[PDB]
Design a protein around this ligand. Structure first.
Ligand SMILES: [K+]
Ligand SMILES: [K+]
Ligand SMILES: [K+]
Ligand SMILES: [K+]
Ligand SMILES: [K+]
Ligand SMILES: [K+]
Ligand SMILES: [K+]
Ligand SMILES: [Mg+2]
Ligand SMILES: [Mg+2]
Ligand SMILES: [Mg+2]
Ligand SMILES: [Mg+2]
Ligand SMILES: [Mg+2]
Ligand SMILES: [Mg+2]
Ligand SMILES: [Mg+2]
Length: 88
RNA sequence: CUGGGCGUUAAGUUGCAGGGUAUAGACCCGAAACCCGGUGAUCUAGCCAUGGGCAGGUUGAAGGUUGGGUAACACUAACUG
């Protein structure tokens, strides 16, 4: 659902460089962008269970990446959740 | 018609008094009712407009705020109401 330009902007904003697409912060930011974007789609299409499964997969993947980041480096995790506006 | 029915050989009429009858309230008193035209919503029934009344003490719906909760809901606790 994210466009190429938006994906590249997120990668540049959260990674070490434009090639840092694999960092945990970049992945979590991309997942957050997709989840927030789909919120509008599921507000209108409440019975789109099949697509909602893919959304819930993004949510669980973000949770697992966040727990890994918190286990590894607490400061990076705190900065990332503050920047993204996530409760945890 | 041999006949048979009704008649012919018995004074009426007009007043006055009286007895009966008729039409009328017709010996007097007495219904429940029926019809016609009026008077009544100062009681009461409903409605309409315009004003008033309801000491004192309780219970604690929805809603709201904050926290928890959720990807977002949902949900949950306290306070408020
Ligand atoms: K005769
Ligand atoms: K006479
Ligand atoms: K008489
Ligand atoms: K009659
Ligand atoms: K009246
Ligand atoms: K009262
Ligand atoms: K309440
Ligand atoms: Mg993907
Ligand atoms: Mg006489
Ligand atoms: Mg007489
Ligand atoms: Mg009759
Ligand atoms: Mg009157
Ligand atoms: Mg009143
Ligand atoms: Mg009172």
């Amino acid at each position: 659902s994210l466009s190429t330009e938006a994906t590249a902007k997120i990668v540049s904003e959260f990674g070490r460089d434009a090639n840092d697409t694999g960092s945990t912060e970049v992945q979590v930011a991309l997942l957050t962008a997709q989840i927030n974007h789909l919120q509008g789609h599921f507000a209108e299409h409440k019975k789109d269970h099949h697509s909602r499964r893919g959304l819930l997969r993004m949510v669980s993947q973000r949770r697992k990446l966040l727990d890994y980041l918190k286990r590894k480096d607490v400061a990076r995790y705190t900065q990332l959740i503050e920047r993204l506006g996530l409760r945890r």
